[PDB]
Amino acid sequence: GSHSMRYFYTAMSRPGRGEPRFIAVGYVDDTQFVRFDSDAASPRTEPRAPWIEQEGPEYWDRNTQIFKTNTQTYRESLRNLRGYYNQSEAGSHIIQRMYGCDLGPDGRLLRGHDQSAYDGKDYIALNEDLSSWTAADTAAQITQRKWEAARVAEQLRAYLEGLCVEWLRRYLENGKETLQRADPPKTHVTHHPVSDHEATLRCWALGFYPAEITLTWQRDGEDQTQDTELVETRPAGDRTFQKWAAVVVPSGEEQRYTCHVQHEGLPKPLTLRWEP
């Protein structure tokens, strides 16, 4: 029942290979719905989920103007940050930004976010009060002063509490059949001998949405945290996600082991064992 919207911006310089690329994507939860790429043959905001397509040409042109302006703004920001760090004109650098709003199950604003990074390190973030900044170093302090002068925190607060929430709610309604539908994992346990005296038990979760899940193995009812090989949750490509967790167990202590599965889509949490 909890929902969020986020935009993710990536700006990458590439000296000797033209002007910096800017690409923006937008998400509601684990569903991407828009993209803009300054490298595209004809740069424009494009729909990436069916329920966004019903938005009119004024929506698309408003997004495109915003993202075109950002392309220019980030190119200057890249110049500026190069200078703040005394860096040579030879290397490629990346600024990233992620911002958006979280709603609780009642649809009210839980909190807002706006964070930026430079070469993958935290650079500047809006504090949870939506009024003040945390700057990582003396370079970021310069940005902080520029941002205070343009009343940025104030503008973000108005957006995060207003437009962000309102549009997130709109999308959740327009896309309710998917965005507000949790699909439970399909699960099973596999067994493969690794040797005479040990076997792998692998607990699979497939076809679930949203991506948040917990898979654990227990031996005699206690967690096997250090003994579990856990794979990153991965996209199937059809909106759903996949994950597995594995333990190497002594033969035949298999029945002492249980896989536990927690997901929003499930009527009740699952306990599974290998079923020979």
Binding site: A24, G26, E76, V152
Partner: peptide
């Protein structure tokens, strides 16, 4: 809908 103001860093 994205945030509408972009400010140089």
């Amino acid at each position: 809908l994205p945030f509408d103001k972009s400010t140089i860093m």
